[PDB]
Amino acid sequence: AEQVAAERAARKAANKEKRAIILERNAAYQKEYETAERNIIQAKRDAKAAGSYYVEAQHKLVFVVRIKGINKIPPKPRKVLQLLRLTRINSGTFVKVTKATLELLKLIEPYVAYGYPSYSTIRQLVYKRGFGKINKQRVPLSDNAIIEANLGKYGILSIDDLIHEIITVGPHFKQANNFLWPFKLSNPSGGWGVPRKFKHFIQGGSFGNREEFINKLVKSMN
Amino acid sequence: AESHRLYVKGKHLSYQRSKRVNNPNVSLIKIEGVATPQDAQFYLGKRIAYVYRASKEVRGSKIRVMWGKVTRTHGNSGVVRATFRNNLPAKTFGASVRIFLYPSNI
Amino acid sequence: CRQEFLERVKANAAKRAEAKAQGVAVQLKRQPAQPRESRIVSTEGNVPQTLAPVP
Amino acid sequence: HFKEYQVIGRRLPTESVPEPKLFRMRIFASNEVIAKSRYWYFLQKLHKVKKASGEIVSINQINEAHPTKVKNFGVWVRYDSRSGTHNMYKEIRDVSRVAAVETLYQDMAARHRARFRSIHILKVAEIEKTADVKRQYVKQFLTKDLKFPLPHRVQKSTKTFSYKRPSTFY
Amino acid sequence: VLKKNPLKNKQVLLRLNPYAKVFAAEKLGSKKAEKTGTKPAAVFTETLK
Amino acid sequence: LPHPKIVKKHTKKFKRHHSDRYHRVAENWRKQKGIDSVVRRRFRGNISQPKIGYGSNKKTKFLSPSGHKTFLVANVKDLETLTMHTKTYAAEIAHNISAKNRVVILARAKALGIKVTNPKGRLAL
RNA sequence: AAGCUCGUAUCAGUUUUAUGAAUGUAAGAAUGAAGAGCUUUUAGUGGGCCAUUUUUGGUAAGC
RNA sequence: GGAAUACUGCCAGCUGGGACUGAGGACUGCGACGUAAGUCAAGGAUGCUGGCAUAAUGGUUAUAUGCCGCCCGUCUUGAAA
RNA sequence: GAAAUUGUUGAAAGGGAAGGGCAUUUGAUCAGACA
Numbered sequence: 001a002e003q004v005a006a007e008r009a010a011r012k013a014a015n016k017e018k019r020a021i022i023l024e025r026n027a028a029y030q031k032e033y034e035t036a037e038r039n040i041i042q043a044k045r046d047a048k049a050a051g052s053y054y055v056e057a058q059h060k061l062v063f064v065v066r067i068k069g070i071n072k073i074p075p076k077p078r079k080v081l082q083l084l085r086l087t088r089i090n091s092g093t094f095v096k097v098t099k100a101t102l103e104l105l106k107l108i109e110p111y112v113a114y115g116y117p118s119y120s121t122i123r124q125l126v127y128k129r130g131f132g133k134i135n136k137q138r139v140p141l142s143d144n145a146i147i148e149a150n151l152g153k154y155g156i157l158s159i160d161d162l163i164h165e166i167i168t169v170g171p172h173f174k175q176a177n178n179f180l181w182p183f184k185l186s187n188p189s190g191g192w193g194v195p196r197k198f199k200h201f202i203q204g205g206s207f208g209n210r211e212e213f214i215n216k217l218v219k220s221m222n
Numbered sequence: 223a224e225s226h227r228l229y230v231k232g233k234h235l236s237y238q239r240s241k242r243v244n245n246p247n248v249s250l251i252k253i254e255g256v257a258t259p260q261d262a263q264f265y266l267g268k269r270i271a272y273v274y275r276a277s278k279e280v281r282g283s284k285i286r287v288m289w290g291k292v293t294r295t296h297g298n299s300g301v302v303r304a305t306f307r308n309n310l311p312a313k314t315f316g317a318s319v320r321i322f323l324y325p326s327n328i
Numbered sequence: 329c330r331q332e333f334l335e336r337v338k339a340n341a342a343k344r345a346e347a348k349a350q351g352v353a354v355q356l357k358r359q360p361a362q363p364r365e366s367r368i369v370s371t372e373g374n375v376p377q378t379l380a381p382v383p
Numbered sequence: 384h385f386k387e388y389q390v391i392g393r394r395l396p397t398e399s400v401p402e403p404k405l406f407r408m409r410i411f412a413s414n415e416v417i418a419k420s421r422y423w424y425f426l427q428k429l430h431k432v433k434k435a436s437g438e439i440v441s442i443n444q445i446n447e448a449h450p451t452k453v454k455n456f457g458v459w460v461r462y463d464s465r466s467g468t469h470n471m472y473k474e475i476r477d478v479s480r481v482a483a484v485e486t487l488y489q490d491m492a493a494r495h496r497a498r499f500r501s502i503h504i505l506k507v508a509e510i511e512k513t514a515d516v517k518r519q520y521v522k523q524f525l526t527k528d529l530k531f532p533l534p535h536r537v538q539k540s541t542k543t544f545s546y547k548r549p550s551t552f553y
Numbered sequence: 554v555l556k557k558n559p560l561k562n563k564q565v566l567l568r569l570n571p572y573a574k575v576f577a578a579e580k581l582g583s584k585k586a587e588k589t590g591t592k593p594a595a596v597f598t599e600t601l602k
Numbered sequence: 603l604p605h606p607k608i609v610k611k612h613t614k615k616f617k618r619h620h621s622d623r624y625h626r627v628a629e630n631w632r633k634q635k636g637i638d639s640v641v642r643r644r645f646r647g648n649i650s651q652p653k654i655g656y657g658s659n660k661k662t663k664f665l666s667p668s669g670h671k672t673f674l675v676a677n678v679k680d681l682e683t684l685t686m687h688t689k690t691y692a693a694e695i696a697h698n699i700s701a702k703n704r705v706v707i708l709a710r711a712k713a714l715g716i717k718v719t720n721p722k723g724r725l726a727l
Numbered sequence: 728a729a730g731c732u733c734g735u736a737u738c739a740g741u742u743u744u745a746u747g748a749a750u751g752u753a754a755g756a757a758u759g760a761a762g763a764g765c766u767u768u769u770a771g772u773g774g775g776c777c778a779u780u781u782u783u784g785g786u787a788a789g790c
Numbered sequence: 791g792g793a794a795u796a797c798u799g800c801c802a803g804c805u806g807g808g809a810c811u812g813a814g815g816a817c818u819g820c821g822a823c824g825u826a827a828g829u830c831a832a833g834g835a836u837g838c839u840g841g842c843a844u845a846a847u848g849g850u851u852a853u854a855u856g857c858c859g860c861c862c863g864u865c866u867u868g869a870a871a
Numbered sequence: 872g873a874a875a876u877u878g879u880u881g882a883a884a885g886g887g888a889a890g891g892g893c894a895u896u897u898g899a900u901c902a903g904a905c906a
Binding site: 078095096099135136178 | 756759
């Protein structure tokens with residue numbers, strides 16, 4: 001029989017072409033992030049030079065990690081935690097920040113530790129704890145064809161396109177986020193820092209908004 | 223002449239435990255001359271042997287041995303955890319246990 | 329109770345006619361209150377004046 | 384351990400009122416997030432505003448000007464108690480403002496049982512000229528050629544058994 | 554059949570993300586930037602102190 | 603035949619509660635039906651119970667230490683069934699087979715190369 | 728448990744916006760889920776004790 | 791004026807030590823290196839080497855030792871009793 | 872010719888309880904593989 005190497009070679013050519021498209025996309029995203037953060041730095045410096053003040057653009061993305069057990073929780077927040085897919089303790093998800101989502105966060109403050117993620121944390125979360133909801137069935141990522149097969153409908157064709165849709169909160173954020181199975185994190189490597197976990201972060205605890213120290217926290221949980 | 227010691231003498235203190243539940247699978251060992259967690263990092267992976275003396279001569283010796291490796295530092299005083307092939311007898315809480323110098327990273 | 333629905337559907341009828349009569353990016357959906365965008369606020373006349381519990 | 388923060392806010396720019404008065408204050412905290420929260424807490428007390436009505440415009444770490452010169456600080460403090468709130472003036476000799484407020488917070492907890500949420504730091508000032516330093520325990524160290532010993536010193540043991548019977552000379 | 558993590562095991566790191574070769578080659582994480590002389594004004598300095 | 607190493611999960615016997623206390627209560631396992639039993643509500647320091655978690659590995663289930671499934675055999679015609687499956691099954695001569703017939707089965711199993719688990723059964727000299 | 732539909736846009740102890748004198752509606756808002764509806768019938772079940780927060784009465788004090 | 795450094799954050803930077811794990815069983819896939827052929831840390835352990843070959847594994851068992859562990863059944867009640 | 876219950880012989884343990892679970896030492900005893 002024919003087709004033994006012919007269709008194989010043609011498939012390999014198609015693989016090389018698809019890979020090259022992903023490469024130039026990744027270079028474009030890399031240059032995008034670099035120039036973006038440089039713009040924030042330079043605009044800050046220019047504001048100081050003008051004798052002005054530069055406010056930053058408010059963060060449009062939070063990472064939420066459940067801090068408490070399943071029990072002795074009122075129903076008003078218990079429903080909310082199911083809606084943010086925080087089903088067990090240390091389970092984490094990304095949330096798009098709106099007026100609708102911020103009050104959901106305010107209801108569950110004693111039960112979660114949330115903050116604003118950097119690129120490095122999201123990159124490490126998706127590379128290590130990356131799992132997809134393919135019809136169901138928590139599929140491990142490992143291959144770019146697995147991402148493209150489901151999310152090629154929404155443009156996304158690789159692992160870094162997915163990360164791009166997460167951080168630069170895009171037109172198809174809902175589908176990339178809901179595709180991602182809620183991250184199952186270990187207890188933090190260095191410990192929680194605090195003696196008592198259930199005080200607010202401002203008053204020597206873990207729960208509530210920490211804004212930037214979620215990067216230090218989640219990277220140890222990862 | 224008098225000294226033939228090629229190991230560091232140490233004491234089997236206790237099992238790995240809470241207040242109410244002991245885990246016989248992990249035994250805590252104090253190595254002599256070690257006072258920090260930093261010093262005991264040299265001692266991880268090294269073979270410990272508890273050398274005891276039994277009256278019946280099994281295989282041409284009245285001396286019996288239990289082997290095990292040091293696994294991880296335990297606390298802030300240089301006491302180290304240890305996992306043995308067969309666990310230590312629990313009667314050996316405060317017995318001399320021989321921490322050897324192989325396998326060497328020196 | 330549903331006083332806004334019928335009015336916003338009438339607005340949807342106005343924005344569907346405007347959709348057909350123009351090279352359009354439609355957007356008829358209400359989007360919730362977004363995070364605040366960056367701005368360079370100048371302190372030339374309006375000086376950043378100090379305060380404290382003096383009292 | 385502390386850090387000084389300049390934190391500003393100007394109740395969000397709306398219609399008919401553009402560019403409000405930018406309320407600036409110096410806040411001692413451990414990090415940026417606590418400083419921000421403390422600033423909102425102070426604003427709600429200084430006048431009738433809220434967290435949602437305003438915005439943090441600039442948060443900035445104020446490093447100490449000369450962290451090598453020993454200064455004579457005087458700190459105006461007020462704090463909530465078992466009874467009503469009351470003013471207090473404690474004089475602290477230290478190198479930096481961060482370290483001086485640090486010694487104050489630990490002393491306030493030690494002598495008055497006031498935690499971090501109770502204490503309102505009003506004003507930290509350098510006392511430039513000596514003999515204007517009011518407190519006697521600070522004026523105690525401002526004498527000419529101060530030579531004092533440390534009698535009876537403990538020798539910290541690394542082992543359990545010693546072979547000397549220790550000598551607490553100095 | 555088994556989950557090989559990226560970050561460690563550089564081979565699966567190159568399986569995903571073909572740019573990883575180029576990123577490592579140019580260093581691109583330890584990338585230097587050009588300096589300017591935009592000094593802060595008198596107003597910012599006086600209100601900081 | 604190539605087999606995995608055998609992991610048993612529970613080497614011990616699941617003895618009935620208070621089987622060692624009373625003589626009338628057999629050592630044979632029964633579940634404590636009563637609602638106020640500390641065994642049924644699985645307290646700290648009480649006897650362990652048979653549950654499906656203790657299930658043996660499917661690839662090494664029913665296997666003797668040698669990696670053989672034991673198979674009871676009465677006579678030659680039943681032993682001749684394991685001609686093809688010599689490294690999977692091993693013969694077990696039934697308890698009631700006479701000393702006259704055991705020598706027949708042992709010689710025949712030596713010829714076909716089928717392993718007998720119990721020689722020395724009724725083989726006194 | 729059984730049959731017949733749709734496996735869906737059938738919805739949710741949740742937030743938002745708007746309508747209103749901590750509860751009421753609607754949504755071409757958010758977020759979450761593939762276990763939805765309709766008949767037919769078949770077991771068990773029909774006590775309460777403790778505590779937190781609202782609120783009305785109380786008094787040496789509990790309440 | 792010209793520098794250093796702390797702290798904070800990043801590196802798809804490099805280099806050691808230690809622990810537990812090796813599931814699967816001809817080949818398919820995704821990759822990397824190579825001028826190509828071929829190789830590989832890339833769809834889950836192989837290579838080399840030694841002692842013993844029996845009571846040395848291990849089991850059953852009597853005891854010792856560390857830690858845990860109310861007496862079952864019924865009947866009450868919101869519970870224990 | 873069972874158990875309850877008892878005698879003898881051999882081993883072991885035992886300072887105001889005993890029997891039970893996890894783990895091991897010790898003593899006793901036993902299974903294959905080397906057909």
